[model samples]
Target: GQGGGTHSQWNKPSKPKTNMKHMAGAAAAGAVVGGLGGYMLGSAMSRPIIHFGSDYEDRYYRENMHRYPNQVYYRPMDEYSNQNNFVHDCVNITIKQHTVTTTTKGENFTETDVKMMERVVEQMCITQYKRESQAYYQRGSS
Candidate 1:
């Protein structure tokens, strides 16, 4: 009599390690989408120019038309300038005649390029002046 029966396989089969292989591949290939569509978080200031299209409107924006340059700089440069004007209390800003363009045949726009920029700066200064003056008066009155 065979005292000990021959047990060829002692170990049980493990679950098919299925998901790890596939999971690793997915993790590797799906690592890029989060890197795009990076919009700026600095919205404390105003978006002087409103947007016409949806968030994913890159298709038309890239080809059909575009707003100003990549960005705009509308700050009170007077403070940054060498001279300091004591009358820095304007807070009631007046706006321009053109907030949106309808008839410019050209595709892209940069007011800075043409004399349009000069007036653009004028608008900025005027606006800042009004805003400052208004705040000063309000703060003074009340």
Candidate 2:
């Protein structure tokens, strides 16, 4: 009788080590996915303007083309590296009669630039908003 009773008891199912490994692996995976998820959501929510070649652009251009003949318009701004300095914001709006090419710095625009931007926007409104056409306007009753 060389076998001991304690040796047989040690082989029972009371001890659990597999659960710890599984929990550790799950926590690691969760941390990675959670970080990536935050990045994805923030980027999506903070996008400055609509992307190029989007379905909305396609539909909008198609509808507006009928109104303005031989006119090219770009919404928001097209940002790209400029002269190896940094990114720049630009809007290319070409009217049938003329064209206005406007640009601004990548970040921290100045007050003068902001005011110029407002003027450009006002010019766009005057160009787009029809003056003689009968639009949705509530006139005071006589």
Candidate 3:
């Protein structure tokens, strides 16, 4: 074989990298300052509350008496109440208000007084029981 190649040389052990630590620290400090400024500005402004309460019903002459139908308003005067029923009744006076009322009507009317006018009559000389009467007379004479 011909002469062998010489050995290769080694490159530099390491190279310089971009310095990122300073940039990161600067970004964090800027963010912290911005946070403080925003907090101070927000503290200077505020909002208002809503209105309420002054319309309660009990503040007036409560007119609730008409709301309930059975609510008591008048005193009792019933005749059949306990004092007059299970207790007793005193009918002292016998006289009473005997005022009566009546009406009368007279007229000169035709036979048509009855709206449904209808009827008939036979001759007075007619004899319906003649045969039975004759038979009874013959038996009696014999």
Candidate 4:
């Protein structure tokens, strides 16, 4: 008579509560990774410089001459430099040179201009990261 069908415990387990510790740990991990990513991105956004040289063997030294100058013909600039801006200017100049060479029959650039074209292309590629890195921060800051 005491064991009725209604209003009984029925020996069933209760539902589990939310796990706050697990949620907090996940959020912390995400923050750490996000911060690391931002820092790396910021570092890459710093502009680079492009250097040109005739010989391939001394290319490395010429490119890094600002860091360690060559007594014969190397000098560091008084200010920091950015290769992205340099390449942009180079492209503008090269296009103008090409136009002059093609349109004006009486005018042409030196054969060295040809060599400089290849170097500008390479620098543009290396500095392409500036666009992406800046874009990333721009969107986030907005």
Model 4 clash count equals: 1
| Alpha-carbon lDDT of model 1 | 0.34
Q: On residues 1-142, what C-alpha lDDT tens digit does candidate 4 reach at each position?
A: 5775666665977898885554443334222331212212211122233444546624652443332211111111112275445444434433443434454645333454434444544344335545545765788945
Which ranking of candidates, highest TM-score first?
A: 1, 4, 2, 3
Best by TM-score: 1
Over 1-142, each residue of candidate 1 has an lDDT whose tens digit, in order, gives 6578667977887776555454443335333332224322111233232223564443333342333222222334345343233222111121111222323434334442233323333434444456656775788845
Shift of residue 124 alpha carbon in model 4, Å: 3.9
Model 2: per-residue Cα lDDT over 72-107, one tens digit each: 233221122242111111122232112221122123
Full-model lDDT for every candidate:
0.34, 0.29, 0.21, 0.38
Error in Å for residue 85 of model 4? 20
Error of 1 at 78 (Å): 7.6
Q: State the weakest 10-residue window (summed lDDT) of model 1.
A: 88-97
* Candidate with the greatest lDDT versus the true structure: 4
Q: Ten consecutive residues with minimal summed lDDT in candidate 3? A: 92-101
Ranking according to lDDT, highest score first: 4, 1, 2, 3
Better of 2 and 4 by lDDT: 4
Candidate 1 off by > 4 Å: 1-74, 77-113
How far off is residue 22 in model 1, in Å?
A: 17
